[PDB]
């Protein structure tokens, strides 16, 4: 993408139409005449341009007026309203930029926010950059939540976030720029390992390989083309969906073989009666003869009558012989026919043994990708958010990706070791009871106008609750919590004083024995400067591999290495960690998914805020008091960092909507 | 519109593995009867076919004739005359078999021979002979 519309592109807007959001802040302008919107359009585009080729510091509306030409920089109000607008939404003026106008000198209300995940680091440093009093409430003693960064000597490897999934529209390119990312890409090539500890012939992976892609497009086929959504009253899973259309290509070699055998006997049953009358004419051939030889030996001289006879036997005899060669033609030809049909079996089977368990790595392959167990995952929704997929090949934080929300932090006053334990919201306001993680008894109260939780999806469904709700959250919130999915993942840290693992390979398989353990240990990353490998464990094996001790854990991991690499190839490891991402109390599983029975919509009812109830009866409706963000709620950019930041971002332009008021509506 | 090439995925076939619990396992174990119900039904007619392949052994070179290979003439001579009645009687109007008979006379002349000594060996009264004897 080139020019300004390259801007509108990277910050994931349509260049030539404006957006649904946009009409309700320029409804003037969209309802109006073609020319005006062009006008708008460009002028969006421009004003985003001048803030991405320079994200290290603030854009001014003056800055933004003065690289405008004519005839869009004659109208300013106009040119005001876009760059406010855009600055509201953190699409421009977002992270850490040098600011020109130092904050203004005092404040205008006040925002507890609930964790500083990047979700909440995002939201405070946009409401504190819009004037507001914001303090964020941590129950860990660190920033950034589910981007963890395990450091020990020169070794850096993330237990949390990893890969930034392409810069193509990613708002985490923008924050890549403003702070030093080493970002490493990351080459895809993945060379897989039977238990035995041999590769894969490349023959082999790429059949299974093959396969398993058309068995998803088989799954969307039964989706969508099929309606095959419900079973029993119960939403289908990819899971079921994908045995099924297993089960159908089980039963469809077994079908051909049998209407290829069921050829080969009406064959074989042809050749049978053929046979049966040309050993009933041989039959008469034989008898036929001796009576001609009969007829023959009667010596001449003879009456015409016995000559009758030799002429008559002998045309007899010609006539079945014709007969008997011409069903020996017929012969022959049904005899090789045969040879054809038994020499073009159809497939013996639909898939062996062995390749059955190389295509259960690149289930849990997927299974670590949602980090769900297939079984899970919704058949309509699992892949809703597809189209929104950036572009540009996947890297890695190479210096580790807590310099993140470390960097974000900056500026901003977190409470850290405070568990919230409560959370009150009424007409008035909101008070928020913590307590001290370390001595529990003692208790903290905040005053606020607003609260903004960007609590995990697994803390908001702990029962009983972590943190109770006064009064508690309707009907609608709770249910939405119950429907959507909660996943898991783990990582296993691996440090060495060696590289013994091709290092031109990034990350290499190991396939599991059985289905059921096809999640264990199944993946391995080498994608750090030092000697760290990185042991994935995903689907069903993760949440049973979090009862199983680190010592036993890393056991495992270096039985399979030996496996592949030699058995003295392979040292102990220096340093080890593993991580409980499900027992961890402040997280409660990885991230997201799509479950059976849920949609994207459910995202939607997630960042839906809650408003109070009057405190007088009969009483005005009352203001939005009760907020949220996280991965959680955003329906586009689910279980990603870039999720939780722009959810982050959302908010907080909605809160300062509130509580600051939207000059640029008009 | 279309599945991927070479996966099969008929919505009648869908409804017919899902339909119970074990529908699945069911289906797929009829077929792995119905194969080896089919399978030894054919090494039945497999060895049924290689007797019946081994009676005709030999073929029939014992009892083949070696080759007529006279020249249509135009004469009846009577010895000609009387082979053509008797065979009038046995064949009817196969002419093919009767110029077979008696060696020497083209098909044509064979019909042609009926027309004009049809009064004369009542040609009529011999075929009356024949279709009575069938
Ligand atoms: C193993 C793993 C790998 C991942 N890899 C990637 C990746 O490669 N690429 C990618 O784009 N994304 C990835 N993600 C997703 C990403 O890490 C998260 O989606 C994102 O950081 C979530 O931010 P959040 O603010 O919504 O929640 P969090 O980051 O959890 O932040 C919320 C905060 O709330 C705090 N909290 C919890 N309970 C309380 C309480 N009672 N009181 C006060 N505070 C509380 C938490 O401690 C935390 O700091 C990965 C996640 C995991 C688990």
């Known amino acids: ?666 | 519109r279309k599945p991927p090439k070479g996966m099969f995925l008929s919505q009648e076939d869908v409804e017919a593995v899902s339909a119970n619990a074990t529908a699945a396992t069911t289906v797929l174990r009829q077929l792995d009867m119905e194969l080896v119900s089919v399978k030894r039904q054919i090494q039945n007619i497999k060895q049924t076919n290689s007797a019946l392949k081994e009676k005709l052994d030999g073929g029939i070179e014992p009892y083949r004739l070696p080759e007529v290979i006279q020249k249509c003439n135009a004469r009846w001579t009577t010895e000609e005359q009387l082979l053509a009645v008797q065979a009038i009687r046995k064949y009817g109007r196969d002419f093919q078999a009767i110029s077979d008979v008696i060696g020497n006379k083209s098909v044509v002349q064979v019909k042609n021979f009926f027309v004009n000594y049809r009064r004369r060996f009542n040609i009529d009264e011999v075929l009356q002979e024949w279709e009575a004897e069938h």
């Open chain 1, 1 to 666: 993408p080139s020019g300004v519309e390259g801007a509108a592109f990277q910050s994931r807007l349509p260049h030539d139409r404006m957006t649904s959001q946009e009409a309700a802040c320029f409804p003037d302008i969209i309802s109006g005449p073609q020319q005006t919107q062009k006008v708008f359009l460009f002028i969006r585009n421009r004003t985003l341009q001048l803030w991405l080729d320079n994200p290290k510091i603030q854009l001014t509306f003056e800055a933004t007026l003065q690289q405008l030409e004519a005839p869009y920089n004659s109208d300013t109000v106009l040119v005001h309203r876009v760059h406010s607008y855009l600055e509201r939404h953190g699409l421009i003026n977002f992270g850490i930029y040098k600011r020109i106008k130092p904050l203004p000198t005092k404040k205008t209300g006040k925002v507890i926010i609930i964790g500083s995940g990047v979700s909440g680091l995002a939201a405070a440093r946009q409401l504190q950059s819009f004037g507001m009093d914001v303090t964020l409430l941590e129950a860990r003693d660190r920033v950034g939540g589910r981007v963890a960064t395990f450091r020990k000597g020169n070794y850096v490897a993330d237990l949390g976030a990893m890969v930034v999934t392409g810069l193509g529209g990613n708002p985490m390119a923008v924050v890549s720029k403003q702070v030093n990312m080493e970002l490493a890409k990351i080459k895809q090539k993945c060379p897989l390992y039977e238990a035995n500890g041999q590769a894969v012939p490349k023959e082999k992976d790429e059949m299974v390989k093959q396969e398993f892609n058309r068995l998803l497009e088989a799954t969307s086929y039964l989706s969508h083309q099929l309606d095959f959504n419900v079973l029993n009253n119960k939403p289908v899973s990819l899971g079921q969906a994908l045995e099924v259309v297993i089960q159908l290509q089980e039963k469809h070699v077994k079908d051909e073989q049998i209407e290829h055998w069921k050829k080969i006997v009406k064959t074989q049953e042809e050749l049978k009666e053929l046979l049966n009358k040309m050993v009933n004419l041989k039959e008469k051939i034989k008898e036929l003869h001796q009576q001609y030889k009969e007829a023959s030996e009667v010596k001449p001289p003879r009456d015409i009558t016995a000559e009758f006879l030799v002429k008559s036997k002998h045309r007899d005899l010609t006539a079945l012989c014709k007969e008997y060669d011409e069903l020996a033609e017929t012969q022959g030809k049904l005899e090789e026919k045969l040879q054809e049909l038994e020499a073009n079996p159809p497939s013996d089977v639909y898939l062996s043994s062995r390749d059955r368990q190389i295509l259960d790595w690149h289930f849990a392959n997927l299974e670590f990708a949602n980090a769900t167990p297939l079984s899970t995952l919704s058949l309509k929704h699992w892949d809703q958010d597809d189209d929104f997929e950036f572009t540009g090949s996947h890297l890695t934080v190479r210096n580790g990706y807590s310099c993140v929300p470390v960097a974000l932090a900056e500026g901003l006053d977190i409470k850290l070791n405070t568990a919230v334990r409560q959370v009150r919201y009424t007409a008035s306001g909101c008070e928020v009871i913590a307590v001290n993680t370390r001595s529990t008894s003692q208790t903290f109260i905040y005053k606020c106008d607003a609260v903004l939780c960007t609590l995990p999806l697994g803390v908001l469904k702990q029962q009983p609750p972590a943190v109770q709700f006064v009064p508690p959250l309707p009907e609608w919130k709770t249910s939405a919590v119950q429907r959507m999915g909660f996943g898991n993942l783990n990582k296993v840290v691996l440090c060495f004083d060696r590289v013994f693992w091709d290092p031109s390979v990034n990350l290499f398989g190991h396939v599991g024995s059985t289905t059921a353990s096809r999640g264990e240990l199944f993946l391995f990353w080498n994608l750090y400067k030092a000697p760290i490998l990185l042991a994935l464990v995903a689907g069903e094996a993760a949440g049973i591999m979090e009862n199983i001790s680190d010592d036993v854990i890393v056991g495992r991991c270096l039985a399979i290495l030996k496996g592949i690499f030699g058995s003295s190839a392979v040292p102990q490891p220096k340093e080890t960690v593993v991580s409980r991402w499900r027992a961890d109390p402040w997280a409660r599983g990885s991230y997201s998914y799509v479950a059976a029975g849920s949609s994207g919509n459910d995202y939607d009812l997630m960042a839906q805020p809650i408003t109070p109830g009057p405190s007088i009866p009969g009483a005005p409706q009352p203001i939005p008091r009760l907020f949220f963000a996280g991965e959680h709620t955003i329906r586009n950019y689910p279980a990603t960092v870039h999720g939780a930041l722009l959810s982050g971002l959302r908010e907080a332009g909605r809160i300062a909507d509130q509580f600051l008021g939207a000059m640029y509506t008009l």
